[PDB]
Design a protein around this ligand. Structure first.
Ligand code: J8G
Length: 238
């Protein structure tokens, strides 16, 4: 993900079929002639999309030009959380389903997975980062404390950012409770708050290489959001 100074990032398309599917998702949602109310409302929760991009001398090399959701922050604290009970799509082979469930076998039980975090610590004027193995190590016994770490700045728990995150997730949940036309697999929520207020908190949906047409509620995604809200809610009692 290449960061441009003008507040928009360039996300390289994943290899096929994943990159192409993510391009068609953004194109569908941000279609200039779209008047589907479900899709127009969905735009509120995604990074703004500026179209396909490639370097002038390299039309082979495909990127999505997207809003940098951290741009308005001075010391952004960033957490990426995968949502859903299944991290594989409805058309995966048995081998791939097994590979995806083995990556984190608690996905069905918990409904979400912390992919990484970058947290600003006030006393040291520095960041502490957690990679993919942090969230994959969390169980039902340790998910609450695992999530809490994102909101602890070295001297206090940022309950303002926790409460704001609940309020922003709730609008996303309401969108999912009022649509029956898309199911989202291996998609995420990007959380951002100000490390240096309630407070600039940004919560945005990202990662759309496995979004499919459907006739039903995305039950796995709803389950994940609800459980994530419940965990964040319990953190307010710390
Ligand atoms: C579909 O994918 C997207 C779309 C986006 O719009 C952003 C985005 O805006 C962003 O800041 C980041 C990001 C930047 C720096 C980090 O350290 C980090 O963990 C995430 O990832 C994105 C991914």
């Amino acid at each position: 993900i290449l960061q441009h100074p003008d507040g928009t990032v360039l996300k390289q398309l994943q290899p096929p079929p994943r990159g192409p599917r993510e391009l068609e998702f953004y194109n569908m949602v941000y279609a200039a002639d779209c008047f589907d109310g479900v899709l127009l409302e969905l735009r509120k929760y995604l990074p703004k999309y500026y179209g396909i991009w490639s370097p002038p001398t390299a039309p082979n090399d495909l990127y999505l030009k997207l809003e940098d959701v951290t741009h308005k922050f001075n010391k952004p604290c960033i957490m990426d959380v995968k949502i859903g009970q299944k991290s594989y799509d409805p058309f995966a082979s048995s081998e791939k389903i097994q590979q995806q469930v083995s990556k984190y076998p608690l996905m069905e039980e918990i409904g979400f997975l912390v992919l990484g975090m970058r947290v600003y610590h006030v006393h040291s004027d520095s960041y502490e980062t957690e990679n993919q193995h942090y969230g994959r190590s969390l169980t039902k016994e340790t998910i609450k404390d695992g999530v809490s770490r994102f909101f602890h700045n070295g001297y206090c728990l940022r309950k303002d950012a926790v409460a704001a995150s609940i309020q922003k997730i709730e609008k996303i949940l309401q969108w999912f409770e009022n649509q029956k036309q898309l199911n989202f697999y291996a998609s995420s929520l990007l959380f951002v708050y100000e490390g240096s207020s309630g407070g600039e908190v940004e919560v945005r949906m990202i990662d759309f290489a496995h979004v499919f047409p459907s006739n039903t509620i995305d039950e796995g995604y709803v389950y994940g959001l609800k459980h994530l809200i419940s965990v964040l809610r319990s953190i307010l009692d710390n």
